[PDB]
């Protein structure tokens, strides 16, 4: 009978967008899938396509002065570390000046979007376009974080970004001999969700993941596999984790910061105070986005919220119009923002899940005789549904 979500050009593009192995392309967690040399040494380099929604480094500096504990301020300067002693203080931010004197980082996105040399319609992607056109003079290209409420466009001069071990980095002050403070990728229930992180290359093609990146929650779908002629969410997998949460949001920071999350990131060297960057490694991974990134929020039949966790990329969707499927690289948020909308190009359709019950009737799938459950998929208020339901009286007797 088919995979609806797969017998339509229609859906295969939509399925596509959550598939961050094909554009994406990059560790998540970390992002670190391409190399470049700068002044005869290579270097790890961020390389995602998708931009990455809500995560932050959070720094381990100590929690007194001149200590900031924020990214987003400036990489410090040779004097400001002879002042404060180990660990660095600062930030991950470039703090470049050019020869005029005007300020690389944050730059403003009112400048920004009245520039031509700027050929992206959103503002995400200025930013981003901004990233990838701006790198004693190399190659590199920085991530950059786009912090979306204050309209300001940040250039990282530091690519790291994850370090732990008392051999590499102090945490807190301790121990106290670490020239770095510890630091890693988070993402928070509450905190930091207008904050966009991305590899350069987000940039090149500024436009591209408006429909290549799964940027938003779905709401109201659990993520599936087609299987046994039907769509199989990811609590009836033997592979999927699912652990119980308090809300939707722990859900989507568990889809970021799971063990299996692609993740580009066992260092062989204690970073300088200078290090902004990676070494290259002889035996590095590349994820390729391949990971534990794909998840939802649900409520089982116990009353408990739930969240269920895969590594499958998802080729069919359950309706359950009280979930919501996260990935590691999107939002909890389910709305469109004002800044990946053309300021104006007109708006680039989903309208792969609307329908209307006379042109899309209810189909009903074979018996899957081992679940005794069968597929049925059918059109409730103008929204495709998918379901695994009761099978025929008929069918039954060969479950
Ligand atoms: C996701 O994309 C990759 C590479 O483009 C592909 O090999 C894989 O089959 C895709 N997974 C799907 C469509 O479920």
Same mark, same amino acid.
């Given at each position: 009978?088919?995979?609806?979500?797969?017998?339509?050009?229609?859906?295969?593009?939509?399925?596509?967008?959550?598939?961050?192995? +094909?554009? +994406?392309?990059?560790? =998540?967690?970390?992002?670190?899938?391409?190399?470049?040399?700068?002044?005869?040494?290579?270097? /790890?380099?961020?390389?995602?396509?998708?931009? =990455?929604?809500?995560?932050?480094?959070?720094?381990?500096?100590?929690?007194?002065?001149?200590?900031?504990?924020?990214?987003?301020?400036?990489?410090?300067?040779?004097?400001?570390?002879?002042?404060?002693?180990?660990?660095?203080?600062?930030?991950?931010?470039?703090?470049?000046?050019?020869?005029?004197?005007?300020?690389?980082?944050?730059?403003?996105?009112?400048?920004?979007?009245?520039?031509?040399?700027?050929?992206?319609?959103?503002?995400?992607?200025?930013?981003?376009?901004?990233?990838?056109?701006?790198?004693?003079?190399?190659?590199?290209?920085?991530?950059?974080?786009?912090?979306?409420?204050? /309209?300001?466009?940040? =250039? *990282?001069?530091?690519?790291?970004?994850?370090?732990?071990?008392?051999?590499?980095?102090?945490?807190?002050?301790?121990?106290?001999?670490?020239?770095?403070?510890?630091?890693?990728?988070?993402?928070?229930?509450?905190?930091?969700?207008?904050?966009?992180?991305?590899?350069?290359?987000?940039?090149?093609?500024?436009?591209?993941?408006?429909?290549?990146?799964?940027?938003?929650?779905?709401?109201?779908?659990?993520?599936?596999?087609?299987?046994?002629?039907?769509?199989?969410?990811?609590?009836?997998?033997?592979?999927?984790?699912?652990?119980?949460?308090?809300?939707?949001?722990?859900?989507?920071?568990?889809?970021?910061?799971?063990?299996?999350?692609? #993740?580009?990131?066992?260092?062989?060297?204690?970073?300088?105070?200078?290090?902004?960057?990676?070494? +290259?490694?002889?035996?590095?991974? +590349?994820?390729?986005?391949?990971?534990?990134?794909?998840?939802?929020?649900?409520?089982?039949?116990?009353?408990?919220?739930?969240?269920?966790? #895969?590594?499958?990329?998802?080729?069919? *969707?359950?309706?359950? #119009?009280?979930?919501?499927?996260?990935?590691?690289?999107?939002?909890?948020?389910?709305?469109?923002?004002?800044?990946?909308?053309?300021?104006?190009?007109?708006?680039?359709?989903?309208?792969?899940?609307?329908?209307?019950?006379?042109?899309?009737?209810?189909?009903?799938?074979?018996?899957?005789?081992?679940?005794?459950?069968?597929?049925?998929?059918?059109?409730?208020?103008?929204?495709?549904?998918?379901?695994?339901?009761?099978?025929?009286?008929?069918?039954?007797?060969?479950?």
């Amino acid at each position: 009978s088919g995979n609806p979500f797969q017998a339509n050009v229609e859906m295969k593009t939509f399925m596509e967008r959550f598939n961050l192995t +094909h554009h +994406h392309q990059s560790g =998540i967690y970390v992002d670190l899938g391409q190399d470049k040399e700068v002044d005869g040494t290579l270097y /790890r380099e961020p390389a995602g396509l998708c931009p =990455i929604w809500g995560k932050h480094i959070e720094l381990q500096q100590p929690d007194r002065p001149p200590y900031r504990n924020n990214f987003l301020e400036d990489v410090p300067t040779e004097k400001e570390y002879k002042q404060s002693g180990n660990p660095l203080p600062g930030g991950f931010n470039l703090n470049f000046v050019t020869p005029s004197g005007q300020r690389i980082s944050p730059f403003p996105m009112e400048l920004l979007e009245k520039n031509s040399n700027i050929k992206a319609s959103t503002d995400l992607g200025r930013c981003a376009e901004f990233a990838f056109k701006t790198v004693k003079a190399t190659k590199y290209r920085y991530p950059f974080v786009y912090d979306s409420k204050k /309209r300001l466009c940040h =250039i *990282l001069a530091v690519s790291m970004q994850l370090m732990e071990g008392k051999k590499y980095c102090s945490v807190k002050g301790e121990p106290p001999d670490l020239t770095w403070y510890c630091f890693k990728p988070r993402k928070s229930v509450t905190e930091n969700h207008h904050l966009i992180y991305g590899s350069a290359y987000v940039g090149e093609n500024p436009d591209a993941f408006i429909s290549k990146c799964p940027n938003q929650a779905l709401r109201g779908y659990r993520f599936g596999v087609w299987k046994k002629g039907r769509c199989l969410d990811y609590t009836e997998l033997t592979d999927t984790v699912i652990e119980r949460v308090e809300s939707k949001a722990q859900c989507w920071v568990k889809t970021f910061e799971n063990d299996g999350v692609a #993740s580009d990131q066992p260092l062989t060297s204690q970073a300088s105070w200078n290090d902004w960057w990676p070494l +290259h490694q002889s035996d590095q991974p +590349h994820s390729g986005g391949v990971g534990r990134n794909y998840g939802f929020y649900y409520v089982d039949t116990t009353g408990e919220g739930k969240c269920a966790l #895969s590594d499958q990329v998802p080729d069919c *969707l359950v309706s359950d #119009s009280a979930a919501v499927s996260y990935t590691a690289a999107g939002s909890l948020s389910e709305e469109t923002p004002n800044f990946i909308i053309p300021s104006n190009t007109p708006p680039t359709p989903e309208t792969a899940l609307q329908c209307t019950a006379d042109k899309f009737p209810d189909s009903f799938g074979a018996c899957d005789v081992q679940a005794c459950k069968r597929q049925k998929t059918s059109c409730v208020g103008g929204q495709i549904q998918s379901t695994s339901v009761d099978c025929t009286a008929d069918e039954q007797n060969e479950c």
